[PDB]
Amino acid sequence: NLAPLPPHVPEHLVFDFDMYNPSNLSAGVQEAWAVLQESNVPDLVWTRCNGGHWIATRGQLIREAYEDYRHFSSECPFIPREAGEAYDFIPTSMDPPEQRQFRALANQVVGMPVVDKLENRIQELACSLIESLRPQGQCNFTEDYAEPFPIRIFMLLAGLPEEDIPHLKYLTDQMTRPDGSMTFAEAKEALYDYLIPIIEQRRQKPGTDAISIVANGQVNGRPITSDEAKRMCGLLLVGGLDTVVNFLSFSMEFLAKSPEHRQELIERPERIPAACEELLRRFSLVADGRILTSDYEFHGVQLKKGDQILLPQMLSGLDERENACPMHVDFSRQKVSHTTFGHGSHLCLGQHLARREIIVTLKEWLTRIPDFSIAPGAQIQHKSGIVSGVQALPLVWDPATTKAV
Ligand code: HEM
Ligand SMILES: CC1(C)[C@@H]2CC[C@@]1(C)C(=O)C2
Ligand SMILES: [K+]
User: 66, 86, 198, 355: most buried by Cβ count inside 10 Å?
Assistant: First the structure.
């Protein structure tokens, strides 16, 4: 259903793309979004779906807008509008200058030095999951690896019990791919209800877990408030539970369908980090945006104060003006251009954790289960939203072709 076109939006710029249910979804979600880059589609279009909003369709505009926080504010960064208005996670809902003191604190719980200290446990968990799967000759990848591997690591980092995963995962998914049972505001209220007593507990009796570190932290040398600590911890949980989880499934679906790409990584393992970057480009998965702070003419188009603009991080790397033959996965691609982890002052703080999780997965899986395929018959379905994903990924292999390490 289509919101009436506002007076200021030109009719020739209308392209009614629905970011939560794109027309071409059955072709694969990145393909469905890539319809925005077909030959006669402008660089900046308006969709009347999901309340009405702009979409930048090309890397050049996506990058420019993410650099210009004075015109394109993160105070309302999600479509639809009621989700963006309710969204108050820190640091994402803040612009410079005030955003930066909170980044610095977040970076202390998810930054490179923390990832270094988690390295052994990440390795161990990946190995244990894959060894337990190996003799079985099949798995449901999304439930059996893509979910438990990154999520258990996050719950370890945060000092949260694993049995809380089903509830937290349900709430996080309502924020990014809602099934309709909860609004964003209701899912956020429920995440905060979970965190409130845990934050108070850990301010009274600090531990060394991520929640204690945020809740007792300072920002530019003054103490964080309880409310700030909640709004930061909520975001960290969303990052831990609904990013890498989805990305792994796109990457493994691809590797299951492409024996020659797996053979490349089996024959030349040194290539894994490069392969991780090219998969992060091809199977990019996030699309959020910004709100106009004022009336502003951008690339010949009159934007009005309060308009929302979706700036899909997914699209920059898929743009043939950034990467030739963008739908082709080439592990030797010379200049891998992408904004998969975002761009500008909100560049992902979890990207070092994400890459370590991805590269360990590829190394440890291909080492033990070098040969596998999609279960015969399976019609793999994607789902689209703020973070896109894979509904189910049934894999099979012959245990005789596997290796214990
Ligand atoms: C493949 C995995 C990941 C992708 C593709 C991803 C992508 C993104 C993108 C696109 C943004 C910027 C959003 C904006 O500008 O509005 C971002 C921000 C952030 N992400 Fe990641 N993310 C991933 C993994 C993680 C993980 C594992 C964590 C935490 C455990 C995390 C924590 C953060 C935080 C805290 C921010 C906010 C930074 C700020 O606003 O200054 N992300 N992520
Ligand atoms: C868009 C994101 C991937 C980024 C980290 C989690 C997420 C859903 C946000 O709310 C900011
Ligand atoms: K808001």
Answer: 66
Could you say which ligand is closest to the alpha carbon of residue 314?
1
Q: Which superfamily does 1-405 belong to?
A: Cytochrome P450 (1.10.630.10)
Residue 83 CA, ligand 3 centroid: distance in Å? 8
Identify the residue whose C-alpha is closest to ligand 1 atom 37: 92
Phi, psi of 161, rounded to the nearest 5 degrees: -65, 140
348 labeled part of a ligand binding site: yes
CA-closest candidate to residue 77, choices 306, 289, 311: 289
Resolution (A): 1.6
Q: Do the beta carbons of residue 354 and residue 247 sit within 8 Å?
A: yes
For residue 239, the CA-to-ligand 2 centroid distance in Å is 6
**Could you say which of 111, 348, 367, 371 is catalytic?**
348
In terms of DSSP bridges, do strands 53-56 and 308-311 run parallel, antiparallel, or are they unpaired?
parallel
CA distance 71 to 90: 20
Q: Which amino acid is at 268?
A: R
Q: In what order do the strands lie in the sheet with 44-47?
A: 44-47, 53-56, 308-311, 288-292, 72-73
> How far apart, in whole angstroms, are the C-alpha atoms of residue 156 and residue 357?
14
343 lines ligand 1 (CB under 6 A): no
